[PDB]
Amino acid sequence: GHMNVKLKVFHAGSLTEPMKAFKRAFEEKHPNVEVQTEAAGSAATIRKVTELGRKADVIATADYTLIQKMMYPEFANWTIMFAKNQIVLAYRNDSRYADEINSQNWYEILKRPDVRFGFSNPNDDPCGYRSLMAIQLAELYYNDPTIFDELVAKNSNLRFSEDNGSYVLRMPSSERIEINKSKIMIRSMEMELIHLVESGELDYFFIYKSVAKQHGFNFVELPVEIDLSSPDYAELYSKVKVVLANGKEVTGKPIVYGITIPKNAENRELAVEFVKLVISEEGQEILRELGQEPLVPPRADTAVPSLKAMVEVS
């Protein structure tokens, strides 16, 4: 009825567990509000608003730059950066060769003919393009120009080209992506790969550390030089770029999650309260307890007057 407001929050798949907690905490404070959450790869999440005509009160992505590139200026005009993450290679203890995989031999294990691994669709999900970025960055770190070629390029139509030191991969439209089903499985968002690994259909998958921990997967920590986790290695990460099918270019960057309130939000006031919760100490702790490092203090890409005291604007 008129005493039941719905706050619509569309978010990155990797924010699924944190969102359950944000929803419970928010509703405890606003008993007449139902926070309606929907998970999808961040680019697909944004398209709900930018292309499908749906209205959301809060948009949260796993890569703040997608809000900037896809929503400015028609659907948003500021982004608050509130969390970080790290790419790891996760598996079950009964995954093929789980007993021998480690940080030094991970890519050789993935190269074995019977090993199947997964990553999400780069056109829809930052985890997917970040997975390809990490594998290509591995070529530079291990001084082995064939890691990406053997694992991905020979098992799909996804290929990195070199251009004066940097590498660029141009994505085919999603409908034209080709994958060798004997070696790789892809899904729109990384969260959808979870059940494939649990069923044994996949042995390994590229995924955020927080999600691996939340779902009880073991994992190989990859070099900081390739895992997109540290602000301090931005210069190395920037050597790889992926051009998404929608034409937007994403560059390897330290993983930083963004949140915004779309310009056309139906319940802006409540949305402000929700964003405040996410970047408050309570919200930072919710993330930490779920295995995801919060960005403390939160930052914004531009002034955000209705939230000035909560954010650092450079």
Task: Summarize as ranges the residues that interact with Mg ion (CB under 5 A).
Answer: 139, 145, 148-149
Rounded CA-CA distance 236/253 in Å is 9
Q: Confirm whether residue 107 is marked as ligand binding.
A: no
When the beta carbons of 167 and 205 are compared against Mg ion, the nearer one is 167
Q: Which of 122, 222, 235 is nearest to 179 (CA)?
A: 122
> Which one, 78 or 148, has the nearer CB to Mg ion?
148
The minimum distance between CB 146 and Mg ion, in angstroms, equals: 6
Min dist CB 149 to Mg ion, Å, is: 4
Q: SS3 for 300?
A: strand
CB of 129 to Mg ion, least distance (A): 17
Q: Is 208 annotated as a binding residue?
A: yes
The encoded tokens of residue 284 equal: 């930072």
Nearest-angstrom CA–CA distance, 239 and 251: 8
Q: Would you say 29 and 64 are in contact if contact means Cβ atoms under 8 Å apart?
A: no
Q: Which is nearer to Mg ion, 43 or 153 (CB)?
A: 153
Q: Which is nearer to Mg ion, 184 or 189 (CB)?
A: 184
Q: Which is nearer to Mg ion, 138 or 197 (CB)?
A: 138
d(C-alpha 238, C-alpha 166), whole Å: 8
In the bound complex, what is the minimum distance in angstroms from residue 43's beta carbon to Mg ion? 25
Q: Nearest approach, Cβ of 298 to Mg ion (angstroms)?
A: 37
Q: Nearest-CA neighbor of 97 among 15, 220, 7?
A: 220
Q: Enumerate residues 6+ apart whose C-beta is below 8 A from 154.
A: 180
Location of structure tokens 């996760």: 90
**Nearest residue to 83 via CA among 233, 302, 278, 220:** 278
Is 42 labeled as ligand-binding? Answer: yes
Using the structure block, give the residue that is written with the tokens 């729109």. Answer: 188
Q: Whole-number minimum distance, CB 135 to Mg ion, in Å?
A: 9
Q: Of 92 and 159, which has the nearer Cβ to Mg ion?
A: 159
Amino acid letter at 51? E
254 is in an annotated binding site: no
Residue 13 marked ligand-binding: yes
- Residue 126 in marked binding region: yes
Can you tell me the distance from the alpha carbon of 209 to that of 218, in angstroms, rounded to the nearest whole number? 10
Q: Is 99 annotated as a binding residue?
A: no
Residue 125 annotated as lining a ligand binding site: yes
> By the 8 A CB rule, do 77 and 182 touch?
no
Residue list, annotated binding site for tungstate: 13-14, 42, 125-127, 190, 208
Residue list, annotated binding site: 13-14, 42, 125-127, 190, 208
